[PDB]
Write a protein that binds this ligand. Structure first.
Ligand code: MCA
Ligand code: DXX
Lengths: 169, 510
């Protein structure tokens, strides 16, 4: 239910963006931290120049429905993507959120990653990706398997055109 | 020829003075009395002081029939050459009405085509002041051929170097097709343009119309859709031409030079209150444009034609951009035949000259009406879809409010290649209105069932969050951050390199 004024909706927007950014929640974030690991968003915030991150798909949602995916709430489908700068240089980046279903690669998540890579290719900028995952999302079966096929094809498409740096965290 | 060099130099000066006098003092006073500058005054006012370098002042016609053998026709009625505008090299032509009514002699057309070829060869803009009775009748098919060569040349230069036409007097007949083939036509209140004159119209159809009613600036702007700018007089046309040129590059291999950049991208909360949350209330989309572009500056193109859609040049951090925006305060912002043309032409031009396209969306669909269907809205609306799908410049779209079905796609969403799409919290992207939707999905089943199903369909698909859930918009944003969001996208996509399938050309709808 949307607020009656633009001001209300903007405040409403802010509250919703916060929920998404909280990812899997306090307990899981505490567990990530207790393991000596930063969160998906801390990694991007630490890597990119202060305030340069421009996120794409924060509100993106999976469309899968089997084995409980129809009721599951999966913030950003487990990956934070966008563009920013490093020492002023434009870059595109992705960061898997292990707090959201173990960072398992959902179909939509992989689509978000590929679109970000396609933008790096299109604009001729480097691409950096923080990996933190249990692999293809089992509940989505072949839907998530397809996501990886597209990702691998994209990695090769970018190979030798723009630098690609992977960080397994 | 004089006896000495010094003496021949003086002779040359006197001879050049005679040429530049054109049709003589009497005819020049008449031109001025009609509130028109002379061909040479126009070039002198347009170009930087003393930059004009003339070619062909002494060029003469070679025709001889029907009095031409004895006629004295200075520069054959046109002044051509090169100069600079704010330091930028340009080539230009300017018809001299005092000489045989500016009629287009064969040689005149050759001079014009040669100047056009030089503009192409060197990659500079080409500007032309028209003031003529059309093809010179005494030269029959010779003057006819000249026009054939001119039109072909306008097409050769199309999409390569910017072409600006300034109609500053009569433009009787087929000559009008040259301005049509250039990119922008600026018309003064002292100018007229038409394919068939009022007299011939009367003789053939019986219709009574004055030249003013038929093809004056207002008629072409508001009715015909033939021109891009209306100017009160020559001074105004000259100012408009320079302003227009300031947004464009020299040729298609470059992006326009930045001008007076305002690098601030701070938020402006004032943006939150321009678009009413109440769908039944309109507003001027230009108020939004003013708060997002540098210094609130913009040059609206075809401002008096199809006002249900705004097309304007402006700048963001000094970079030229073309803005296409629905105007909710006119015809509820519906797109129609004329606005589709107006938008498509603008999009194709910006794409040709590497000018990014920024869309401000608030469209409820295409205008309903038997005459819209009978007028071929199917093929005209397709022009928008074509232009945007073909365009490769950065395309940034911001949905302010309504975004319904095909009319939304026509405003360049992600599927038509927009590089970044943002939705305000008031964004209403939908395949169609919830009411119309229910009347089909739930045809079967009190009166509250209908109102209930409407709310159901509405919440399920038409909120900014569903659009974002599906990835149709990159983010939902605070209207206050609109400028920064556009500026950042323009910045990241400044290095965009996108290629199309190999082809001579696609088949653009007619
Ligand atoms: C290809 C093609 C086509 O359309 O398809 C052609 O172009 S056939 C094109 C046909 N184009 C035309 O028939 C239109 C021409 N005539 C006019 O409608 C008008 O002249 C007008 C609206 C341009 C101007 O009206 P105005 O009263 O200001 O003036 P004036 O009558 O004094 O004229 C200017 C002087 O230029 C001469 N003059 C004007 N137009 C032409 C022309 N096309 N060829 C040869 N001479 C011309 C006039 O005879 C006159 O001569 P002087 O001082 O000796 O009296
Ligand atoms: C018909 C016409 C000729 O062509 C004209 O100028 O009116």
């Amino acid at each position: 239910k949307l607020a009656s004024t633009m001001e209300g909706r903007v405040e409403q927007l802010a509250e919703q963006r916060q929920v998404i950014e909280a990812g899997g929640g306090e307990r899981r974030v505490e567990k990530q931290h207790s393991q000596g690991k930063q969160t998906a968003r801390e990694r991007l915030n630490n890597l990119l120049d202060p305030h340069s991150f421009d996120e794409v798909g924060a509100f993106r949602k999976h469309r899968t429905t089997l084995f409980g995916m129809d009721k599951a709430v999966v913030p950003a489908d487990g990956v934070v993507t966008g563009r920013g700068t490093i020492l002023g240089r434009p870059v595109h980046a992705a960061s898997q959120d292990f707090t959201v279903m173990g960072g398992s690669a959902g179909e939509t998540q992989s689509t978000k990653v590929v679109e970000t890579m396609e933008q790096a290719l299109l604009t001729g900028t480097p691409f950096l990706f923080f990996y933190d995952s249990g692999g293809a999302r089992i509940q989505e079966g072949i839907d998530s398997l397809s996501g990886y096929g597209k990702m691998f094809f994209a990695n090769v498409k970018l190979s030798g055109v723009v630098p690609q740096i992977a960080i397994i965290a | 020829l004089a006896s000495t060099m010094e003496g021949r130099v003086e002779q040359l000066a006197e001879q050049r003075q005679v040429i530049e006098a054109g049709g003589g003092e009497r005819r020049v006073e008449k031109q001025h009395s009609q509130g028109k500058q002379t061909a040479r005054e126009r070039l002198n006012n347009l170009l930087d002081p003393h930059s004009f370098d003339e070619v062909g002042a002494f060029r003469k016609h070679r025709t001889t029939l029907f009095g031409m053998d004895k006629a004295v026709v200075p520069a054959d009625g046109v002044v051509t050459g090169r100069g600079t505008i704010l330091g930028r090299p340009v080539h230009a032509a300017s018809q001299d009405f005092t000489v045989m009514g500016g009629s287009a002699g064969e040689t005149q057309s050759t001079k014009v085509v040669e100047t056009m070829e030089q503009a192409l060869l060197t990659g500079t803009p080409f500007l032309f002041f028209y003031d003529s009775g059309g093809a010179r009748i005494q030269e029959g098919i010779d003057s006819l051929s000249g026009y054939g060569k001119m039109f072909f040349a306008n097409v050769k230069l199309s999409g390569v170097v910017p072409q600006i036409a300034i109609i500053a007097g009569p433009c009787a007949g087929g000559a009008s097709y040259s301005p049509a083939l250039t990119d922008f036509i600026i018309m003064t209140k002292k100018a007229h343009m038409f394919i068939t004159g009022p007299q011939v119209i009367k003789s053939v159809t019986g219709e009574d119309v004055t030249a003013d009613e038929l093809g004056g600036a207002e008629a072409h702007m508001a009715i015909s859709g033939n021109i891009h700018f209306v100017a009160e007089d020559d001074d105004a046309a000259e100012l408009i031409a320079k302003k227009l040129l300031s947004f464009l590059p020299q040729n298609n291999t470059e992006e326009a030079s930045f001008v007076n950049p305002n690098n601030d991208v701070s938020p402006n909360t004032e943006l939150r209150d321009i678009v009413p949350i109440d769908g039944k209330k309109g507003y001027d989309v230009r108020d939004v444009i003013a708060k997002i572009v540098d210094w609130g500056d913009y040059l609206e193109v075809k401002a008096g034609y199809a006002t249900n859609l705004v097309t304007a040049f402006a700048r963001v951090n000094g970079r030229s951009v073309g803005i296409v925006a629905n105007q909710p305060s006119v015809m509820s912002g519906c797109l129609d035949i004329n606005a589709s043309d107006k938008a498509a032409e603008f999009v194709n031009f910006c794409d040709s000259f590497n000018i990014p396209l920024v869309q401000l969306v608030d469209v409820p669909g295409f205008l309903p009406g038997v005459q819209q269907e009978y007028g071929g809205i199917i093929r005209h609306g397709a022009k928008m879809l074509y232009a945007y799908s073909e365009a490769t410049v950065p395309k940034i779209t911001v949905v302010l409010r309504k975004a319904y079905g095909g009319s939304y796609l026509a405003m360049c969403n992600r599927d038509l290649g927009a590089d970044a799409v943002y939705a305000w919290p008031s964004a209403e992207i939908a395949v169609m209105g919830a009411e119309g939707a229910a009347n089909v999905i739930f045809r079967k089943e009190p009166d509250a069932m209908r109102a209930e199903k409407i709310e159901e369909y509405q919440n399920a698909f038409n909120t900014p969050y569903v659009a974002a859930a599906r990835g149709q918009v990159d983010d939902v944003i605070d209207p206050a951050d609109t400028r920064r969001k556009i500026a950042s996208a323009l910045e990241m996509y400044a290095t965009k390199r996108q290629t199309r399938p190999a082809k001579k050309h696609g088949n653009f709808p007619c």
